[PDB]
Amino acid sequence: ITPPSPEKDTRSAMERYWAEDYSGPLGIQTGEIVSGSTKLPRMYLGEKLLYVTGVNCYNLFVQSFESDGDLGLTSIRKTVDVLVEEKVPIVRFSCSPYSSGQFHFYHDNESKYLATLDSLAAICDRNHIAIIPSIFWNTDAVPEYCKEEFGKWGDKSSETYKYMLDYTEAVVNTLKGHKSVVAWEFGNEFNLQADIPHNYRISANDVSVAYQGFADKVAELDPEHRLIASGNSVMRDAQYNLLHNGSWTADTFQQYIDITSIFTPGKMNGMSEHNYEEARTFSDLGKLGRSEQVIKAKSAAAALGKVYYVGEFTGPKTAQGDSLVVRRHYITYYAQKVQISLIWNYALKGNIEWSFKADTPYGNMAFNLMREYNELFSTLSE
């Protein structure tokens, strides 16, 4: 028989994506579910609507030189074995050295470093692990390496901005052929560095310029046009007012959409937030619980043509072992049909801040919840 259409396919998104007969676009695609003129932007994988929960594995790649010291695969393979055994479907990881003092692991021999990254992606292909590289994890590091002030991220003529383009090109060219790579994320929590009155280093508009240059370069190189994401935390309550007035006045909802747009520009359609044990407050709507915060974030995303995801949220070590604190996140994300949510943080040896490892009480707490909620997500549709 002729194979059935994507909607006629009874398999799930991840199952259809990872099947041997899949020959569709790689990575997360943005489509829309339509009711008349209403187009709700939504994530697709394997041509079906995606709903999944996974983990951060911050050091999935960088452990190859930060821990193993040789750009080898010893710890990577041990880590992937755990991810497979625990049934982790999706992982976010850092795709660059945290410190400029370790940039030599790339520049000493660029082809060796990129070969280890290619190998990681190949291992994830074979083991059916979807990964999201977060390319400029610590935004301090590139300006430091270039002996430039941090604001040069927003200056297209700077060595910092050139390095961003050159490194983006290197990563995308290495990874674009791998079906495990499902999205490209700029870096980690860049928005939190902007417009701080008593720590004044960069403006939201400068960050936006870097995001726009990143997204344009990725779009130029990636024939699969998979999701380009920010890696932002939540916007600060006052994110817009810090930029425009240098004040800590909580933003209105309209101002939140505005500043979200600055921090998710152009071709960057992945609206990341990180959900800590902190509430969202609007000057007009007030202080909200997490359910209403997610509903408001998804409403902002939809209006902007973006898709929301929770790139980090509270894990067992941050919760001091209170499973109810963690469970509250999963309850909300399932109820509000959040399409990707990633708990902080799995580390092979548990040696990353606020992280868990396998076969411990905190590890089991996280992985049991992850499996429990992927079982519920696995039938979700809209």
Q: How far apart are CA 146 and CA 202, in angstroms?
A: 16
User: What's the residue count for the chain?
Assistant: 382
Is there binding between residue 258 and Cl ion (CB under 5 A)? Answer: no
We find the least distance from the C-beta atom of residue 216 to Na ion, in angstroms, to be 40
Closer residue to Cl ion, CB minimum distance, 220 or 353: 353
Q: How far apart are CA 77 and CA 253, in angstroms?
A: 45
Residue 67 interacting partner from Na ion, Cl ion, none (CB closer than 5 to 8 Å by kind) = Cl ion
Residue 360 interacting partner from Na ion, Cl ion, none (CB closer than 5 to 8 Å by kind) = Na ion
Closer residue to Na ion, CB minimum distance, 240 or 344: 344
Residue 185 interacting partner from Na ion, Cl ion, none (CB closer than 5 to 8 Å by kind) = none
Closer residue to Cl ion, CB minimum distance, 59 or 272: 59
Closer residue to Na ion, CB minimum distance, 211 or 356: 356
Q: Which residue has 């960050």 as its token pair?
A: 207
Is there binding between residue 357 and Na ion (CB under 5 A)? Answer: yes
- Dihedral sign (CA 131, 279, 283, 203): negative
AA letter at 165: L
Is there binding between residue 138 and Cl ion (CB under 5 A)? Answer: no
Closest CA to 378 of 34, 48, 77: 48
Is there binding between residue 360 and Na ion (CB under 5 A)? Answer: yes
Q: Are 283 and 252 a contacting pair, CB within 8 Å?
A: yes
Q: Binding residue for Cl ion (CB under 5 A) from 63, 180, 272, 275? A: 63
Size of the site for Cl ion (CB under 5 A): 4
- Count Cβ atoms below 10 Å from residue 303 Cβ, excluding itself: 12
In this structure, the strands spanning 29-35 and 280-282 are unpaired
Size of the site for Na ion (CB under 5 A): 6
DSSP letter string, 202-213: --HHHHHHHHHH
Tokens of 375: 């079982």
Q: Binding residue for Na ion (CB under 5 A) from 356, 367, 373, 377? A: 356
AA letter at 76: I
Cis peptide before 345 (omega within 30 of 0): yes
Closer residue to Na ion, CB minimum distance, 43 or 352: 352
AA letter at 187: G
Is there binding between residue 59 and Cl ion (CB under 5 A)? Answer: yes
Stretch 4-43: interaction string toward Cl ion, x if CB under 5 A? ----------------------------------------
Is there binding between residue 364 and Na ion (CB under 5 A)? Answer: no
Q: Binding residue for Cl ion (CB under 5 A) from 54, 60, 66, 231? A: 66
> 93 — phi, psi (to 5°)?
-145, 155
- List interacting residues with Na ion (CB under 5 A): 350, 356-357, 360, 362-363
- List interacting residues with Cl ion (CB under 5 A): 59, 63, 66-67
